[PDB]
């Protein structure tokens, strides 16, 4: 287990993916040319998980950039770290998906899919020991959503034994670019339930609420939302890219986090919450960092963790702090909040501490929870879907692509079963 | 106050012995409580 192959699909996927690469390059001391200029051996110890070493001192992201639209790709190349990417790894179409899952999954996407697989095969065959794949995409669009899930299925076919991981961004009416987002999301959730091993549920509803309510940003931009996404992505991948004992690879993370195959949707959390401009800040102790685990205000999925129960939790502390203090504080939270952890999975909270804090902060905490409360996110999508589907509104955009009504009914039913499954384990007891 | 000891050996670095403080209460050997091959394993 070594290399992770990263895929970026659609507008959102490429925007969030590009930010992930500039954040992690900065943490690993890599400049936009690919040269390491850091001053810590920890930065290079597990550099091979995300970077290929090219001739000389240069490091190249093992990243494939995908879109059915060319514009986003140009914006990435023009960017700060745009030059770091492998030129041959940009795979783009000319005919977009027009925020239509059917175009991304069946028409335009199907036409481009083989060109993408050719690039993923090149990266995969170069690997000493491929862990698997990491996909960043939105569920509300057409490319990220439809083509992204098509790619997952095509990759799963060729690499059935590798770990399939995603960072899936959930649509919200609060920051919506299309009226059909509930359809695109439901059709994609159906695909993810079946085809991924782990999915980080990144909710735009929660990101907007954090920016507006907590960061006091009257009109949040994608730039503001993406600052929270990149902080979360950096946090959840800490264990994979730095030397550590816990969840050091994609499979060990999945084995510790996924008790039942379909229940692989994670609720990420982050503390402290910061705004792009906020380079202040003077705060955050160990008890303070720990308290934000149950804090709904710090969740990247718009669910209250106190409305459910944690099946499994992974908590990552970053910065210079006492491991003794972390262990005490973490035990206190489990003992005080006993009722929000399932009794039939003993020692289900695993903690890791990394000496390297993320940029701008001296101390941070990242939470990865497998909570039954994630059903609130799926319920929200199902109700938005049904409001439209009941009247067959905008259905012509999908049937016009060759889709049948049954696929819509099936996707919805599968998502409602997922909700019902979370509820089942929420109500389960250690009567054993 | 009384005890029995049974000397075993002495060597370059050793000297061992038994000790008996309360002898067996029932008398005699213990009275209470496959395969494989290569074919069986494969």
């Amino acid at each position: 287990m070594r290399e992770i192959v990263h895929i970026q699909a659609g507008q959102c996927g490429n925007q969030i993916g590009a930010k992930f690469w500039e954040v992690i390059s900065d943490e690993h001391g890599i400049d936009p040319t690919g040269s390491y200029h850091g001053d810590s051996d920890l930065q290079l110890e597990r550099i091979n998980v995300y970077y290929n070493e090219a001739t000389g001192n240069k490091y190249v992201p093992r990243a494939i950039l995908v879109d059915l639209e060319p514009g986003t790709m140009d914006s990435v190349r023009s960017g700060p770290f745009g030059q770091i990417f492998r030129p041959d790894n940009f795979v783009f179409g000319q005919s977009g998906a027009g925020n239509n899952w059917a175009k991304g999954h069946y028409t335009e996407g199907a036409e481009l899919v083989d060109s993408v697989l050719d690039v993923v095969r090149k990266e995969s065959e170069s690997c000493d020991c491929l862990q698997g794949f990491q996909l960043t995409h939105s569920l509300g669009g057409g490319t990220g959503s439809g083509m992204g899930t098509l790619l997952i299925s095509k990759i799963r076919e060729e690499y059935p034994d590798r770990i399939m991981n995603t960072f899936s961004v959930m649509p919200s009416p609060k920051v919506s670019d299309t009226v059909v987002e509930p359809y695109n999301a439901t059709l994609s959730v159906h695909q993810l339930v079946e085809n991924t091993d782990e999915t980080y549920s990144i909710d735009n509803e929660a990101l907007y609420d954090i920016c507006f309510r907590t960061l006091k940003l009257t009109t949040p931009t994608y730039g503001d939302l993406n600052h929270l996404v990149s902080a979360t992505m950096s946090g959840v991948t800490t264990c994979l890219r730095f030397p550590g004992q816990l969840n050091a690879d994609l499979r060990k993370l999945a084995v510790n986090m996924v008790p039942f195959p379909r229940l692989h949707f994670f609720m990420p959390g982050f503390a402290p919450l910061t705004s792009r401009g906020s380079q202040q800040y003077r705060a955050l102790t160990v008890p303070e960092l720990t308290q934000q685990m149950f804090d709904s205000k710090n969740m990247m999925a718009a669910c209250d963790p106190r409305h459910g129960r944690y099946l499994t939790v992974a908590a990552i502390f970053r910065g210079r702090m006492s491991m003794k203090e972390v262990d005490e504080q973490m035990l206190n939270v489990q003992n005080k909040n006993s009722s929000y952890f399932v009794e039939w999975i003993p020692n289900n909270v695993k903690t890791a501490v990394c000496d390297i804090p993320p940029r701008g902060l001296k101390m941070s905490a990242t939470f990865i929870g497998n909570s039954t409360a994630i059903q609130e996110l799926f319920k929200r999508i199902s109700e938005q879907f049904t409001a439209m589907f009941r009247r067959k509104a905008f259905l012509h955009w999908y049937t016009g692509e060759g889709m049948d009504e049954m696929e819509f009914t099936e996707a919805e039913s599968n998502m409602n079963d997922l909700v019902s499954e979370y509820q089942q384990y929420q109500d389960a007891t250690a009567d054993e | 106050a009384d005890m029995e000891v049974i000397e075993l050996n002495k060597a370059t670095s050793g000297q061992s012995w038994e000790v008996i403080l309360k002898p067996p209460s029932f008398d005699g050997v213990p009275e209470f409580n496959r395969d494989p091959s290569l074919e069986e394993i494969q």
Binding site: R251, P259, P261, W344 | M3, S16, E18
Partner: protein, 431 residues
């Protein structure tokens, strides 16, 4: 000549192996390059090359290369020949099924070929010492696979284990109870004697006795190595008790399945402490009957003894020992089973405990390791079995094992075997 082959499986096994071999070298005066400027018994553990270099009779195995890569870059890189440090590419991902079946099946033949090459250098091979964790996929899965194959290739050859019983303070997987029960069931019929080391007991000794706020594997292993060295000192030096591997079994194992002795070590003293009075034989002997010095957390006062071995090391006189045993009997019940004599088999090995320079342990003139087969050890199995039951009732995480080709029936079989083992400890203590 009576050679012993040491096998170190997975991260725990390899890391404990590093601590053991470092200590053996200090005890026998072997430098990290295998050179020694020199009783002769050390030859049971170290072979000799044409250049006068001393090489451990050991194999280090891991399914991932990281841990072993540290041995082959480290201080003792010249001590071992490259062929005895075996690594795969893909780990068992804390999954017994991956370690035993999927991944293990690829490297098994290579590991046995290396073991065979070491055995070919032996004139009187006694058997094997197997070091592994219960919790990891390699430590659990690969060990049981290897143990089965060793029984086939080395017909009625002694196999002893040093098993790392899992602790939540240092646990890396939620599935450790599953891996622990699966490995215990499969290995039970293949092991002659197994010494469990509870990571919590070791963690607590480091915290309490060595004043280490947050003990690391380095701290834990140094302490573990001292107990392993106490058990193996009479094989590596001209000892009187536990002189051969068959003698461990004879002295401590009354029934084939009840082969899990409890180790208790004393004294454990901090190095960064003010000069203190050396402990007497009475003081160190008293410490053996204190549950705080145990290697496994359990209550012997709630159990019954079936065998007790006291292994003294250093400046110790038989008169001092007998006086200490006599006073203990006057104050303590020390209850034995009906069919066993109330007694101790005592051994004195003249070499005082050696400690790693710059280590956490203080140098002492005398130390002692008590190996007792008590029914109280069943408490450790019960704790593990209960955690297994909690998850298994919901089939939580079971899909990971089934996906690797394991059958759900193997989980039931393993658990029923553990229930029979708990029942055996109960039946053995009856009268």
């Amino acid at each position: 000549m009576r050679e012993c082959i040491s096998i170190h499986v997975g991260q725990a096994g390899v890391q404990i192996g590093n601590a053991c071999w470092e200590l053996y070298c200090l005890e026998h005066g072997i430098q990290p390059d295998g050179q020694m400027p020199s009783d002769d018994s050390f030859n049971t553990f170290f072979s000799e090359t044409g250049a006068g270099k001393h090489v451990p009779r050991a194999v280090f195995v891991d399914l991932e290369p990281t841990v072993i890569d540290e041995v082959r870059t480290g201080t003792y890189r010249q001590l071992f020949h490259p062929e005895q440090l075996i690594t795969g590419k893909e780990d068992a991902a804390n999954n017994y099924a991956r370690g035993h079946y999927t991944i293990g099946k690829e490297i098994i033949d290579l590991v046995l070929d290396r073991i065979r090459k070491l055995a070919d250098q032996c004139t009187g091979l006694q058997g094997f010492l197997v070091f592994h964790s219960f919790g990891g996929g390699t430590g659990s899965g690969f060990t049981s696979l290897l143990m089965e194959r060793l029984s086939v290739d080395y017909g009625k050859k002694s196999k002893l284990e040093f098993s790392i019983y899992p602790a939540p303070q240092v646990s890396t997987a939620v599935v450790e109870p599953y891996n622990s029960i699966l490995t215990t069931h499969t290995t039970l019929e293949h092991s002659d004697c197994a010494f469990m080391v509870d990571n919590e007991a070791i963690y607590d000794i480091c915290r309490r006795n060595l004043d280490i706020e947050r003990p690391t594997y380095t701290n834990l292993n140094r302490l573990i190595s001292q107990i392993v060295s106490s058990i193996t000192a009479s094989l590596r030096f001209d000892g009187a008790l536990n002189v051969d591997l068959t003698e461990f079994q004879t002295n401590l194992v009354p029934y084939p399945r009840i082969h899990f002795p409890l180790a208790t070590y004393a004294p454990v003293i901090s190095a960064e402490k003010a000069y203190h009075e050396q402990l007497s034989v009475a003081e160190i002997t008293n410490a053996c009957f204190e549950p705080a010095n145990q290697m496994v957390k359990c209550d012997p006062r709630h159990g019954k003894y079936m065998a007790c071995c006291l292994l003294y090391r250093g400046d110790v006189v038989p008169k001092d020992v007998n006086a200490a045993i006599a006073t203990i009997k006057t104050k303590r019940s020390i209850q034995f089973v009906d069919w066993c004599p109330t007694g101790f088999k005592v051994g004195i090995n003249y070499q005082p405990p050696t400690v790693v320079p710059g280590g956490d342990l203080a140098k002492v003139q005398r130390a002692v390791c008590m190996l007792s087969n008590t029914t109280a050890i069943a408490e450790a199995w019960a704790r593990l079995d209960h955690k297994f039951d909690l998850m298994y009732a919901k089939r939580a995480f079971v899909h990971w094992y089934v996906g690797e080709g394991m059958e759900e029936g193997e989980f039931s079989e393993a658990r029923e075997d553990m229930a029979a083992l708990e029942k055996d400890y109960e039946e053995v203590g009856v009268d």
